[PDB]
């Protein structure tokens, strides 16, 4: 059901540079540095009614993530055509239908070959209908200071890397606390991001989000959230947001490409009011864009 | 292919005779599904084990630590008897095809599995090790900020500190940073200034006739090689000590080693461009002890 493409020309030093492969058969060598060391980057792109959302920003961020890990530069033209070909292959077979997504995976390759690996696959996504009406959240220490990306770039803060064990570990801690998700806080007390998403704060009538140089991802959904609010007439701001400001905010959301906007009903067990109509308009906009 | 690969089909506790829990597979062919959480999320644990003269070194310690890493990641308990059997069968198959000769290694990989499926994945492969003869004579090292407080394992267990996980992108990034500075390896230093470990090794400190190593609740691995290194030094009358070692104390050390299963003991010639003496005979004796310890057990 899922479409998988192998990307045979993923990076820059009439061949398409990618081939269809069997999603249900093994495809990665046991010594691919992507699995023995989590040494790669990825992007997840939502595909709504056959259109990839924020395609160019996603491809640019793949290059940015690759650069942070000293990977070779991704061949934008090939990755672009592979996303489009995989969506086209999925829709032809499974027809039109629900929300889809394309996942791009780029690794340093089989150990010892100096030849990076790449895959794109396209599948139907998990159902987020409930999560888009509300989620509970806890804050968790991320260990790093908010300025790691300036002092210590070998820690890869702000790279969308394959090494997400700790991100997953954060989800499990949240579930043990009855929560659905996490907002990370830096060791010096600043709100950062979620394990798979960015945080949006409505406070003092302003739509805020932690500045993107604090070792976090510049979210593509977050940027689109800002366009929504700016056109609707809210002011928007990139800021350093302390842990305390978080709990004093009027309202909160986690946002990301596939789930879109998920409003926070509780943060660390303190309740927050969810404006159902405002969030519904937000998610309608996020789902309908370009 | 030269290397041996075993698929572990019963990696974890929740069997018919004839089902050992593992079967040979082609190391040269693709083996992992693209949605295995081991590659999409680096969500798994691993062990690397030196195999000297047909024998895996410290096999039970490694298996114990596989389980400990598994537990830190909320994975199910690895079936120690399947993994043990899998490693020995792998060593056996490698040697029956390739003969003996040479230092080998076995690598154990355990992941949360194909996503949506609730079934961990597991693999073992055996292959010839990298030539470390030069590094065993000396390496240049630099100190790099790890970003964590020495105590993150106590306060923040979701940060997986002290787990041997597949999410090693940063450990590799540290090596690339050291190479930029013309160095071979890295000693991590915590936010609060404590010597921790290397991205793939543990740190041994000689100072004032005492052999020390950072104590292993500081969000670091308890190294199987470090334990064998303590055995060597105690046998020669050195006192050994686990403790907190500030980055300052590390500079004032008389000698330093990075130790790990495959490279064994690599003596440090320079740390952040400060020179350190290397006792070539004592280190050669250390490596000879480290290479020969498992023969005793058999
Ligand atoms: C750590 C992290 N933060 C934020 C995001 C949100 O990115 P996007 O909105 O582009 O999907 C992702 C994905 C992520 O992995
Ligand atoms: C992060 C890390 N530290 C230390 C070590 C050393 O452990 P061992 O001597 O058992 O190989 C390893 C391996 C490691 O991955
Ligand atoms: N590269 C290499 C070296 C030796 C043997 C083989 C093999 O296929 O047996 C391969």
Author numbering:
A (entry chain B): 3 to 15, 28 to 304
B (entry chain A): 2 to 15, 25 to 308
What does the published report state?
In general, transaminases catalyse the transfer of an amino group from an amino donor to a carbonyl acceptor with pyridoxal 5′-phosphate (PLP) as cofactor. Herein, we report the discovery of a new class of fold IV-transaminases, which was discovered during our quest for novel (R)-selective transaminases using an enrichment-based approach. In contrast to exclusive amino acid transaminases such as D-ATAs and BCATs, CpuTA1 and MgiTA1 are in addition able to convert amines to ketones, which would categorise them in the subclass of amine transaminases. Considering this and based on sequence and structural analysis, which revealed significant differences especially also in the active site, we propose that CpuTA1 and MgiTA1, might form a new subgroup in the fold IV family of PLP-dependent enzymes.
The crystal structure of CpuTA1 was determined by X-ray crystallography at a resolution of 2.4 Å. The final model contains 587 amino-acid residues (chain A and B), two pyridoxal-5′-phosphate (PLP), one 3-amino benzoic acid (3-ABA) and 327 water molecules. The asymmetric unit contains two polypeptide chains, which form a stable dimer with a contact surface of 5580 Å2 (PDBePISA29). CpuTA1 exhibits the typical aminotransferase type IV fold (InterPro: IPR001544, Pfam: Pf01063). The electron density for the PLP cofactor is well defined and the covalent imino bond to the active site Lys174 residue is clearly visible. The phosphate group is interacting through a network of hydrogen bonds to the side chains of Arg75, Thr234, Thr235 and Ser271, the backbone amides of Thr234, Thr235 and Ser271, and two water molecules. The two active sites are located at the interface of the two polypeptide chains with the main portion located in one chain, and vice versa. The active site is surrounded by the residues R51*, F56, T58, F115, K117, E125, E140, F142, Y178, S270, S271, and V272 (*indicates that the residues belongs to the other chain). These amino acids are building two binding pockets, whereby the small binding pocket is lined by T58, S270, S271 and V272 and the large binding pocket by R51*, F56, K115, E125*, E140, F142 and Y178. Overall, the structure of CpuTA1 confirms that except for the PLP binding amino acids hardly any of the active site amino acids is conserved compared to the characterised fold IV subgroups. Interestingly, a flexible loop (e.g. aa K125-I135 in AT-ωTA), which is present in (R)-ATAs13151735 as part of the active site (the loop of chain B as part of the active site of chain A and vice versa containing an arginine residue, which is discussed to play a role in dual substrate recognition of (R)-ATAs131535) is significantly shorter in CpuTA1 (aa E125-G128) and does not contain any positively charged amino acid.
